[PDB]
Design an enzyme around this catalytic site. Structure first.
Site, PDB file in Angstrom:
ATOM      1  N   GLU A   1      10.133  -7.849  11.989  1.00 17.88           N
ATOM      2  CA  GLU A   1       8.776  -8.388  12.007  1.00 17.88           C
ATOM      3  C   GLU A   1       8.405  -9.103  10.705  1.00 17.88           C
ATOM      4  O   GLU A   1       8.745  -8.641   9.612  1.00 17.88           O
ATOM      5  CB  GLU A   1       7.792  -7.239  12.259  1.00 17.88           C
ATOM      6  CG  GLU A   1       6.369  -7.641  12.590  1.00 17.88           C
ATOM      7  CD  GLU A   1       5.410  -6.455  12.592  1.00 17.88           C
ATOM      8  OE1 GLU A   1       5.750  -5.392  13.158  1.00 17.88           O
ATOM      9  OE2 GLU A   1       4.310  -6.585  12.020  1.00 17.88           O
TER      10      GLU A   1
ATOM     11  N   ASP B   1       9.388  -4.058   9.565  1.00 20.76           N
ATOM     12  CA  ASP B   1       8.241  -4.936   9.383  1.00 20.76           C
ATOM     13  C   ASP B   1       8.321  -5.292   7.908  1.00 20.76           C
ATOM     14  O   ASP B   1       8.031  -4.464   7.044  1.00 20.76           O
ATOM     15  CB  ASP B   1       6.896  -4.266   9.651  1.00 20.76           C
ATOM     16  CG  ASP B   1       5.746  -5.251   9.512  1.00 20.76           C
ATOM     17  OD1 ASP B   1       6.031  -6.434   9.193  1.00 20.76           O
ATOM     18  OD2 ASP B   1       4.571  -4.875   9.718  1.00 20.76           O
TER      19      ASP B   1
ATOM     20  N   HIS C   1       0.761  -1.241   0.000  1.00 23.74           N
ATOM     21  CA  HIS C   1       0.000   0.000   0.000  1.00 23.74           C
ATOM     22  C   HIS C   1       0.796   1.299   0.000  1.00 23.74           C
ATOM     23  O   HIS C   1       0.306   2.337   0.448  1.00 23.74           O
ATOM     24  CB  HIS C   1      -0.975  -0.028   1.177  1.00 23.74           C
ATOM     25  CG  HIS C   1      -2.056  -1.051   1.027  1.00 23.74           C
ATOM     26  ND1 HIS C   1      -3.300  -0.747   0.522  1.00 23.74           N
ATOM     27  CD2 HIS C   1      -2.052  -2.387   1.246  1.00 23.74           C
ATOM     28  CE1 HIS C   1      -4.018  -1.852   0.434  1.00 23.74           C
ATOM     29  NE2 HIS C   1      -3.285  -2.862   0.867  1.00 23.74           N
TER      30      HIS C   1
ATOM     31  N   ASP D   1       3.542 -11.430  13.345  1.00 21.23           N
ATOM     32  CA  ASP D   1       2.337 -10.639  13.119  1.00 21.23           C
ATOM     33  C   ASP D   1       1.307 -11.481  12.365  1.00 21.23           C
ATOM     34  O   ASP D   1       0.356 -11.987  12.967  1.00 21.23           O
ATOM     35  CB  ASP D   1       2.688  -9.367  12.336  1.00 21.23           C
ATOM     36  CG  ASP D   1       1.469  -8.494  12.048  1.00 21.23           C
ATOM     37  OD1 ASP D   1       0.423  -8.687  12.694  1.00 21.23           O
ATOM     38  OD2 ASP D   1       1.559  -7.610  11.179  1.00 21.23           O
TER      39      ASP D   1
HETATM   40 MG   LIG Z   1      -0.186  -6.315   7.762  1.00 20.81          MG
HETATM   41 MG   LIG Z   2       3.057  -6.325  10.390  1.00 21.77          MG
END
Ligand SMILES: [Mg+2]
Ligand SMILES: [Mg+2]
Ligand SMILES: [Mg+2]
Ligand SMILES: [Mg+2]
Lengths: 436, 436
Positions: B295, B246, B159, B320
């Site tokens: 992450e 991440d 995104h 996650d």
């Molecule tokens: Mg996500």
């Molecule tokens: Mg994440």
């Protein structure tokens, strides 16, 4: 009775410190936060900054917070003021400061107290904030008037990349039946604009500006406007969405002329325009696009240009830096017939009472009033209750993106839901919403 | 005693509708808002969307809201449940649903009630939310532990524009002495980053992504990291600010391989890295940059890849999408020694109780716990109180820009102020704040 006044440093939507004030009474703790502009008019009340280069890029508000805790707080509590009497609350604060531009204590030290007091007062009277604000301004509450949201979906100007000179390109769902419908329509047009922008300018052009709108590297206003129209149609809302502009011309006003390419260090000086010349450009756009409002078309002190233009404007002309929410300057604008609408920013003047006075003087002159946020906002939602209390019928608080913007729009959804049929949507009557 | 449960539609930070719930008791009305993710793991609890492409781009939450007012609210009010008994509140909601993934009522219908009930409970007990959350989770409160904020100042991924594969590049001021200082330091690094980014990639590259970070068109992680390190140094905080990443690798995991340029259609499948190859790249980044947390380095079901990497990771590895705040998947992760830290998102599982259980099982395994926001946030500040209540010592709630992020950071500032000497800053002990 007020038992405590406290201020702390919090961060605004741009990551810069700002003042937050809490006022304690028998009814609880009432918190208000102060916003901060970027394209601030030269006549705005003083926003006090520390200027310490080794901290917060020099934008700390420690001095202002200190002015509240060490000066205002003790004197205010001792005075034993009646928060319901907003006039008395503000006369005290204004006198305590003792300067015309609130440079002693700072407008950002005073405003938080001013606003927090009104919240404490509403709880005392056992009424919602918008209702208390209607009483203070002697506004009609039978029925209330919901404002048309003016959403800045495409950003340009000083702090908004590209060569686009004009600062804001807003859409206004004046054709909506309710505020909730207007907001849904606004979100759909906005999302359609993001997808079209990303496709024509690249995925990167999807990132948003300070106020939440897209900020692609566009050169002319014509390009931006044509793009906005395509978004409205692609979203299937043609006929229900109008356009509003914030030129913030003071930002490109140099040597008595206007540079529409001011973000270009090698701007062609022979291309700079005179007031009459710039006016002709506005008329050309006004005839090609569904523009129903133009803000700060000319510089903050270029009275002649404003008067000349207003002669054949035909649409709402909003004064922002020209009037800086100051009754004294508004009276001048009226006399010179420079515009017919006030952009109301509580932090431009410093107190709730002065802001209300500005609004009243405007409505008295047959002017409209568009309540406004600042480019630097917070999670505070005061202006949502204020625009309803003042029954203006029009507000601009950002694109439908970034929660410092959505927070106000959501609050309006709640107020609308709470009022039911005891309120009406200004719609196409946004200009004279107060007269509905 | 709950006399009413109500839900309505409100907008999140991206301008997409989401669910807001209010619970009324003799103590007043308590509001909680549900967040929404973009790079959502396939195992997350169901987020019920309307799917009417003619309204809100198909992201309406009318169905979820209806389930709250028509199915949940009626039965909940009749049950006369005790809001203090969080487990009882959630067993009822979970039982009313009946599905293992909350696909009958929707996780976005259940969560709001679960959270609002806890706020009402704290009010009945006359204590701050973070205090009631500590009680619910049986966490130590002498002293309290303030978290190091992991600020996502440079965004990439699905995104985000550009070609940068990794989703988040965070900075963590572990070297700070208090949360307030950490936030100031973070804000300063962020601003220095903004100016540098605009200077190198153009003014337009100053616009922010969904999470508030700059999102310039970067090709590799190294270029992004060098940029962040230049900002840390230019700001004068070298050595006091660490880095967290991440990867959200599930977003570019194709045909058992990982595509570091999945945003390009004609991406060379020859450049796609295998599990072991991706690991070599990470170790490379780790020795070169002050990275203290990574992450989702591998896909949500690529277990073996996680176990192998963890054997020699040497730093905190956060799960996650792999665990989706689900106690059952956390157990599998522990048994396989796939990671040593859980990213806790209350809306991935659906209730506060299940979230609290996930955290508890994590700490029992010697895992760290980083409370987290979703890319789609609101003015809600629940996670600020949650991370303090859980004593984890670490949270990620965005860059210091956009108020859906600042609202949380500001709330932590208030909590720190209120607690005074009764709280300590996690600092370099972020991984095990619970053991402080
Ligand atoms: Mg996500
Ligand atoms: Mg994440
Ligand atoms: Mg301005
Ligand atoms: Mg303006």
């Amino acid at each position: 009775a007020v038992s405590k006044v406290y201020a702390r440093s919090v961060y605004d939507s741009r990551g810069n410190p700002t003042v937050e004030v809490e006022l304690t009474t028998e009814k609880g703790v009432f918190r208000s936060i102060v916003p901060s502009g970027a394209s601030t008019g030269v006549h705005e009340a003083l926003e006090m900054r520390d200027g310490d280069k080794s901290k917060w890029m020099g934008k700390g508000v420690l001095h202002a917070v200190k002015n509240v805790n060490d000066v205002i707080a003790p004197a205010f509590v001792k005075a034993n003021i009646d928060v319901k009497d907003q006039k008395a609350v503000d006369d005290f604060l204004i006198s305590l400061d003792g300067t015309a531009n609130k440079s002693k204590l700072g407008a950002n030290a005073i405003l938080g107290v001013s606003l927090a007091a009104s919240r404490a007062a509403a709880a005392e009277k056992n009424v919602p904030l918008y209702k208390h604000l209607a009483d203070l301004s002697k506004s009609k509450t039978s029925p209330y008037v919901l404002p048309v949201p003016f959403l800045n979906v495409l950003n340009g100007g000083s702090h908004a990349g590209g060569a686009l000179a004009l600062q804001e390109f807003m859409i206004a769902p004046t054709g909506a039946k309710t505020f909730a419908e207007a907001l849904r329509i606004g979100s759909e047009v906005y999302h359609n604009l993001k997808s079209l922008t990303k496709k024509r300018y690249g995925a990167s052009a999807g990132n948003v500006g300070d106020q939440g709108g897209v900020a692609p590297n566009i050169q002319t206003a014509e390009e931006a406007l044509d793009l906005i129209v395509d978004a409205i149609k692609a979203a299937g809302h043609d006929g229900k969405v109008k356009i509003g502009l914030d030129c913030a011309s003071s930002e490109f006003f140099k040597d008595g002329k206007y540079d529409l390419d001011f973000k270009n260090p090698n701007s062609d000086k022979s291309k700079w325009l005179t007031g009459p010349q710039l006016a002709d450009l506005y008329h050309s756009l006004m005839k090609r696009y569904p523009i129903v409002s133009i803000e700060d078309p000319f510089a903050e002190d270029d009275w002649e240009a404003w008067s000349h233009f207003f002669k054949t404007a035909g649409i709402q002309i909003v004064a922002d830096d020209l009037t800086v929410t100051n009754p004294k300057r508004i009276a001048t604008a009226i006399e010179k017939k420079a515009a017919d609408a006030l952009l109301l920013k509580v932090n431009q003047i410093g107190t709730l009472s002065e802001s209300i006075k500005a609004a009243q003087d405007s409505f008295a002159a047959g002017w409209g009033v568009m309540v406004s946020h600042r480019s630097g906002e917070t999670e505070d939602t005061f202006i949502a209750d204020l625009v309803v209390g003042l029954r203006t019928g029009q507000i601009k608080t950002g694109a439908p993106a970034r929660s410092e913007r959505l927070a106000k729009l959501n609050q309006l959804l709640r107020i609308e839901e709470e009022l039911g049929d005891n309120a009406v949507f200004a719609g196409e009557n946004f200009h004279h919403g107060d007269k509905l």
